[PDB]
Design a protein around this nucleic acid. Structure first.
Ligand SMILES: [Zn+2]
Ligand SMILES: [Zn+2]
Ligand SMILES: [Zn+2]
Lengths: 237, 62, 89
RNA sequence: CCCGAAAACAGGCGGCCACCGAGGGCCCGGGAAGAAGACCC
RNA sequence: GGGAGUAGCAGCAUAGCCGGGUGAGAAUCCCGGCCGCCGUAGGGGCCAGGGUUCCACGGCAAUGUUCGUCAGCCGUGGGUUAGUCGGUCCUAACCCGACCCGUAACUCGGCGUCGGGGAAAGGGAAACGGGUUUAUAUUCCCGUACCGCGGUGGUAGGUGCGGCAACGCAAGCCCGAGGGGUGACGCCUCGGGGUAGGCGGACCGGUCCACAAGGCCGGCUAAGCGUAUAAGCCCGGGGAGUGCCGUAAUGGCGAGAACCGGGUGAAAGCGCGAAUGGCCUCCCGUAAGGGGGGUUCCGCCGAUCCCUGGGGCCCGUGAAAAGCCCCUCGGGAACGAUCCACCGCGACCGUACCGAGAACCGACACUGGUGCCCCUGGGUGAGAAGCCUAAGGCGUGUCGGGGGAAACCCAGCCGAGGGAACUCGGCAAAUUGGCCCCGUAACUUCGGGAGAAGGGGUGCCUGCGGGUGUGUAACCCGCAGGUCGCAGUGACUAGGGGGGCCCGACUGUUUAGUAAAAACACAGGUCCCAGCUAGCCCGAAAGGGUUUGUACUGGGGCCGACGCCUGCCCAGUGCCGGUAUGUGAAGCCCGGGUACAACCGGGUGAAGCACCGGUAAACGGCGGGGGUAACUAUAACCCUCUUAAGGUAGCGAAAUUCCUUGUCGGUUAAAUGCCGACCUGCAUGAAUGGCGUAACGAGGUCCCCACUGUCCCCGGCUGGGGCCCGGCGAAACCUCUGC
RNA sequence: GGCAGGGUGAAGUCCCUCAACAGAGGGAUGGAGGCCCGCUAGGGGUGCUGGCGUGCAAUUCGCUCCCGUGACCCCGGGCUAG
RNA sequence: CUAGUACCGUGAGGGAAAGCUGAAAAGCACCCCGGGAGGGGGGUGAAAAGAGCCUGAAACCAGGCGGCGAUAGGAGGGUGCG
RNA sequence: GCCCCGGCGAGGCGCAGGCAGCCGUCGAACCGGGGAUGCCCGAAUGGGACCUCCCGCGGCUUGCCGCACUCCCAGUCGGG
């Protein structure tokens, strides 16, 4: 037969590739190497829109003139002083190890293993909650409802990510959706497989209907995983 | 349609130009290699057994 | 018109000749005025020009005679006052 | 009423010439006639 | 060979005639005149591509759809001159090499490091006018300039000033470092200041016009050098709320307004360049050549060209680097420029011509395509519309001559009376039409429908008033009166309207070359997987895409704006979870056997199967009977046994109905039609969505008004063919023949 | 690198009058939109089932019709290969 | 034989045709016509074999010669005669 | 097409039947043998190639030599 769109995505062509050359740099923490226990200080110069971040970034000038990017917290001003390190105070925009952040605090941009740089709760409008502290692990509620354990030396930032409420206003036009999907080149517009031919999809045929259950095993090979993949249930409730 | 009219759009830049090693017009100008001798892709000559080109050039039997 | 003059980065001009021909002239565009480092205001005493126009000028005709000409007078007074207030002890 | 001497018994009558030349055509000015030819003055 | 001296040499731009010349020879070549076509392109400039087609002389065997004395053809000789135009320099998306890992291996595949390439329309030192040649010129010559490098001599400065300030100044040299600016950026909309170009009046010369009145032509000024304001932004003084100040509009003010002064700061204009330079014209021998004159003023319109400022939009944010300017710091010497004057030097390649209804691609001197890529005078007029016309170009969208010379065809004009009786079907044609005023329905998502529908007026002349403006300048808005015609948006330009039904919400897309749609997409609704060494995917591997990413995220399905809604079934098929037992391959263990093995029997044995449960906006299903209460039909109510359950709300002779032209009603003189209902639903039904819906549709279908050669019934006219004459000159096809 | 000219008139910003327990009327400014007319240029291809159909053309011509500030049209440099 | 040549295709690639005067150039002096290709006279040679050149077949074309030929019916021939 | 040693012994100047002229008895043309010159690209190699063309750094004295990658012997000279 012929290939699927998700099979063609794996080969890595311009039709499926991200235009990262349009984006501001990557957002990472300073390494622990330079922050053994130094507790640097910085000042915010400017706040900027990023086309590949779903959140605004802020530029910060540090001890030695170095300029870094950060995910901007809600409420941050130009001309603020932000601190990174163990003896930093508890204030919106400051980065601390999870072992110095009390229970009940809102946190974002958390590391999985220390030194990583930031992996979880980065998206516009998100926040996480510290639930419990211990000597072996700290426990955090994530925006999916999942409770996860981190090493207490993993770093995190205090506050909430800026840019929330994007989805309260509707997209009204195919043209606006065109521009939105062209910013980050997502595959748009989207076809339906039940309206393709048989060579093209497990669905497909002159009579436009799925002729067998949409639920598909976890152990099915590529070319077949379409529909509801390993679904525990279906329907509304 | 697909015939006489699209033939008018052959005033762009050419797909092949002359090769410095081979001599003939088979050097792909955008990829940087020759389709007849392999220049720009290999130090050695392009030479396949199913081909008749080099045998013809040397007046050889197939 | 050549394709390089069909560019709109050349600001053509219609010019009449002593012999009466009305030729077209082409020029490059002038760069914009200098701005302050922190405030972003336009600087005074600094003229606009291309490298050609600016290299046929002496130094003292390219910036004012006062400290911190890269700044506006307000910012300059600020930094001077801060320096002198830090230089008490 | 219309077509009709190629009706192979391929007709009848009157008149003219032959046994240089009766007659006919091209040509010229034109329509009542007309695709070329033909027809009429 | 026959076809045949036949077809074709028409249709989209119908173009030639008179006189003279050359020459063996002239419808077709040259000169003049008349007549015509294009005129926001058939005119001008120039990419790519082509490659000598460019120029002059000499020719006509072939080529050119005819001829040819002509030529993009043939032959002989010639022709492209750069410090300033472009390439070389920077980097963008992207590519290559070396090392490295993989591969049986490679001319194969790949991450990271180093290095190198990558734009003749992105960034980016520096020249303008005139003349000269058969053919080149921002390249040659004359005149007047500029840039870089290197020097010669002086000077500012080192070791100096004016201003409260904003700032103004010639304001030291040589190496390195750091910082700031510039280079450097989207879409929409508006104001101000200018320019190219154009219009009017006067004057000077020339020319056309029976006089007169009048009309047309010309009346010029480059780079460079030197000189300023506007906006905006700043500096001093000043000291405000029942408020003042201002814009086309938004607006501004004790976080310092009005008001008074000043600084900085564009495009332009002015001056030198520069007037025996260019243009126009006037006088004698005409070979070189002679002399003379003019080159003036006012006033309007005005860009899509240049500069400068505001405002609005983004779930969308609209390049980088080289190069250039300034400041600070560190280290050196005592000299010495970013100022004035002078000298020297500046490599390599391109440069001819076409740029398309004959120089490119399409086999062609092809109505196609590439390129409409950049630009264009006057009138009417909203107008880059159509019509007429100036400049410029052409008569080469390369065969001509005859004609009452028919029939018939192609493209057009008019038709009495009737007005769709034509036809599957009003196909085609016709009707309306611009501007001002009056007036405007159902329905509606209150935004629309809507230019709804429908009605009245419009020319020319003579005057009178208004608006902005200094204006008897310019551009616009009204009034009265007189008068002509069949007709006054008189040509050109320029909507036929309305009422029902089906489908699809809309703008958008599609089978290049028989299908443009009811098919696709769409915003939106809902479901599924995933906490990152994830989920999904590529690959033989190494590695990689989503990822410069982290649940307001990424990936995977179905339905399809909006409004009201979305019923029952987990037995089957599938997916998910759980579990004691059972089954369960290799391996392991035990026994038997084999001097050792092969071999025989049993036990244990994961996943999976089996077993137990959840799941229908998962695939799908929603039947059967045996009986009916009061007389004509009713099974409308209640038990039952089959099976997991037994079609809920709505809709229904349907784009689904067989019998079918179902029955009733409306529309016709007449109805296999359309609309509305009735249920006997062969074989409707709820996200393979059900029922409605304003607005929209070159979708499909029915009716009405107007209108018409569709039709009764055909007739007349125009141009191009057809016919004849001269010229060039095929093909399909063909057993032999032919009542 | 491009898209003549014209219409309708969203938010935003206001003004006047009578008033007055309430309210009732009337005038402007401003220039949005996958809006409208439009052979501007440019793009497309509905009907005539027109011309042609050994064609001008191995998909063209004419009349009629559709979009035309956007999910628009076009150019130079690059990438995806059975 | 100026052949892997001319020519076709973006490219990978595909791919023709074309031999002979005479022993000797003795390769046609001179004249008339014609704008000219050339024609007619004359010449060289044993023979025009004339460069459009050894021999020079058939199909096909024109002219001359012989037979038939405008009241007439069969695949074009066979038998017998005139 | 230039030079030398041998052979042959008068003509020669390619396929190629021409014009005008040169070379050769000091031994040519031709033949056997040995030398010189030998532009650009190309393994292509000092560095770059969208056009077989461009751009350099050292040392010597305008002309000459050296200057790629992967290695061996060495060693901051060199030889393969
Ligand atoms: Zn090659
Ligand atoms: Zn400032
Ligand atoms: Zn400031």
């Amino acid at each position: 037969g012929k290939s699927l769109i998700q099979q063609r995505r794996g080969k890595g062509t311009t039709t499926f590739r991200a235009p990262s050359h349009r984006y501001r740099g990557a957002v990472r923490y300073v390494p622990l190497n330079l922050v053994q226990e130094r507790t640097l200080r910085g000042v915010v110069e400017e706040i900027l829109h990023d086309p590949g971040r779903t959140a605004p970034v802020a530029r910060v000038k540090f001890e030695d003139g170095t300029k870094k990017l950060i995910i901007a917290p809600e409420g941050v001003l130009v001309g603020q002083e932000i601190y990174i390190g163990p003896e930093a105070p508890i204030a919106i925009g400051n980065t601390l190890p999870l072992a110095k952040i009390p229970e009940g605090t809102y946190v974002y941009d958390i590391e999985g293993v220390p030194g990583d740089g930031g992996k979880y709760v980065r998206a516009g409008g998100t926040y996480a909650l510290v639930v419990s502290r211990e000597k072996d692990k700290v426990i955090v509620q994530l925006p999916s409802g999942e409770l996860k354990a981190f090493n207490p030396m993993c770093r995190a930032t205090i506050g909430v990510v800026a840019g929330g409420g994007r989805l309260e206003k509707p997209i009204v036009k195919a043209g606006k959706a065109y521009y939105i999907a062209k910013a980050r080149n997502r595959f748009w517009p989207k076809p339906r497989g039940v309206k393709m031919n048989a060579v093209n999809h497990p669905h497909g045929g002159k009579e436009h209907h799925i002729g067998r259950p949409s639920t598909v095993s976890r152990r099915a090979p590529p070319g077949r995983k379409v529909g509801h993949i390993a679904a525990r249930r279906t329907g509304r409730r | 349609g697909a015939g006489t009219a699209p033939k008018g759009k052959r005033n762009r830049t050419p797909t092949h130009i002359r090769c410095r090693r081979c001599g003939r017009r088979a050097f792909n100008v955008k990829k940087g290699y020759c389709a007849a001798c392999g220049f720009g892709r290999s130090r050695r000559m392009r030479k396949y057994s199913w081909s008749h080109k080099w045998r013809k050039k040397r007046n050889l039997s197939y | 018109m050549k394709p390089m003059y069909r560019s709109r980065s050349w600001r053509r001009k219609y010019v009449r000749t002593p012999g009466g021909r009305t030729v077209i002239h082409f020029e490059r565009r002038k760069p914009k005025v200098a701005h302050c480092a922190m405030c972003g205001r336009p600087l005074n005493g600094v003229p606009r020009g291309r490298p050609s126009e600016l290299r046929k000028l002496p130094k003292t005709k390219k910036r004012p005679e006062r400290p911190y000409p890269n700044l506006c007078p307000s910012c300059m007074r600020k930094v001077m006052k801060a320096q002198v207030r830090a230089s008490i002890t």
